[PDB]
Amino acid sequence: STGSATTTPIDSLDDAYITPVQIGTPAQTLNLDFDTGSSDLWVFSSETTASEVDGQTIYTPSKSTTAKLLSGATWSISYGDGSSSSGDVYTDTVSVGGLTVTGQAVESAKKVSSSFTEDSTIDGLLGLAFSTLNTVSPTQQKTFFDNAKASLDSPVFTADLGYHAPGTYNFGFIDTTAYTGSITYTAVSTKQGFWEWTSTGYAVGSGTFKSTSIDGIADTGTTLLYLPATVVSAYWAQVSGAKSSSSVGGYVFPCSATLPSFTFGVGSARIVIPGDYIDFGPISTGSSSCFGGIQSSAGIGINIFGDVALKAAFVVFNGATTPTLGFASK
């Protein structure tokens, strides 16, 4: 089997991407944030504290004839950005772009943090990291990909995120018309539960390539590109007026600037992030100070190849017995 779904930016800055997901019988369609950095499929629901729901579409398990309470199971997750959610668990039928899993754990939110409430466009998350990170207790549950894998034509999914435009998540096949040149594959460590890999270096604009190992995660659920302070300083040094602002919480730059591109290495291959992808606009409405899309990972504890990097590539998440990651230009 295969599946193919369009993923759409939630706003004009590509702050996140939503993908429609059918849950239950009859289908209830929710727009979920596909997140290769976590492993829980959780939704706003009829059980969510009413004051914490503000415009989201909810899953109502009582209206699904295939929903079953997973007795005794609870979940609770905290994300790298400080947001969180928790609740109980149902199993139900979940389909993504024509690909159907029966008995998928659907984690129903009883509580969500303010960040989630305030984002009316995201109805929940669909985790695509390794199932070892799944938070369901006392019986850990499998991700949608893990459950689908055996049935897929090939045990892979691909992320093709757009810049200010829709893109695609495919399951079970590689669309050879969706990228240019070849896909370069690189080793993955699953030791921390993530799609963790080592980039071979970077360049800033038309500068020379610096060969240096950068260990980090491919994370569709993180907006920006978080890299070591040395790398980030080298980038922003090429932008007149750019500075790190503690009050704002990262590098800012004059909105009048033209940003240089940033290249990262995948083996001997190179992915070029155009400068425009690195512009996240005014820090506040009407400001001429703009927020940068490349930020330091110092104090996160891990480097994160988030959407800013991934949307410059066609990315293969290969879930073979020994997982690997593939990157192509597009």
Partners of 202 in beta bridges: 210, 264
Sequence-separated (6 or more) residues with CB below 8 Å from residue 326 = 183, 184, 185, 186, 315, 316, 318
Place of tokens 């139900």: 92
Q: CA 314, 320, 326: angle at the middle one, nearest 5?
A: 20
Per-residue b or e along 181-214, where b marks 16 or more CB atoms closer than 10 Å to that residue's CB? eebbbbebeeeebbbbbbbbbbbbeeeeebeeeb
Strands 196-204 and 294-296, sheet pairing = unpaired
Per the CB < 8 A criterion, the answer to whether 86 and 109 are in contact is yes
The β-bridge partners of 125 are 33, 42
Sign of the C-alpha dihedral, residues 284, 288, 294, 295?
Answer: negative
Query: What burial class does residue 284 get, using C-beta atoms within 10 Å of its C-beta: 0-12 exposed, 13-18 middle, 19+ buried?
Result: exposed
Report the candidate in 96, 75, 90, 109 with the shortest Cα–Cα distance to residue 7.
96
CA distance 23 to 107: 11
User: For residue 284, what are the contacts with CB-CB under 8 A and spacing of at least 6?
Assistant: none
SS3 150: helix
Cα angle 125, 70, 5; round to 5? 30
Q: Answer whether 54's CB lies under 8 Å from 112's CB.
A: no
Residue type for position 109: A
Please state, in angstroms and rounded to a whole number, the distance separating the CA atoms of residues 298 and 303.
8
- Reduced to 3 states (helix: H, G, I; strand: E, B; else coil), residue 18 is strand
For residue 277, give the nearest of 191, 165, 185, 184 by alpha carbon: 165
The residue with tokens 């290969």 is 318
Task: Calculate the dihedral angle through the C-alpha atoms of 296, 299, 301, 302, rounding to the nearest 10 degrees.
Answer: -10
Q: What strand order describes the sheet that includes 289-292? A: 243-245, 250-254, 289-292, 279-282
Q: Would you state the structure tokens that stand for residue 5, as one six-digit string?
A: 């779904």
Residues in Cβ contact with 299 at an 8 Å cutoff, skipping those fewer than 6 apart: none
Domains in the chain: ranges and CATH: 5-174 (2.40.70.10), 175-330 (2.40.70.10)
DSSP string for residues in 156-206: EEEEE--SSS-EEEEES---TTSSSS-PEEEE-B-TTSS-EEEEEEEEETT
Question: Can you tell me the distance from the alpha carbon of 272 to that of 329, in angstroms, rounded to the nearest whole number?
Answer: 8
Structure tokens at 3: 């599946």
Output the furthest CA–CA distance in the chain (Å, rounded): 60
- 26 preceded by a cis bond (ω within 30 of 0): yes
Between CA 173 and CA 195 the distance in angstroms is 18
* Residues with catalytic function: 35, 199
Rounded Cα–Cα distance for residues 82 and 61 (Å): 28
Cis peptide before 260 (omega within 30 of 0): no
Breaks (C–N over 2.5 Å) after residues, the chain? none
Integer-rounded Cα radius of gyration of the chain: 20
Q: Which residues contact 301 (CB under 8 A, 6 or more apart)?
A: none
CA angle 232, 238, 241 (to 5 degrees): 95
Phi, psi of 305 (to 5 degrees): -85, 85
Cα distance between residue 17 and residue 164, in whole Å: 10
If you write DSSP's letter for every residue of 203-238 in order, what string do you get? EETTSPPEEEEEEEEE-TT--SEEE-HHHHHHHHTT
Pairing state between β 28-35 and 124-127: parallel
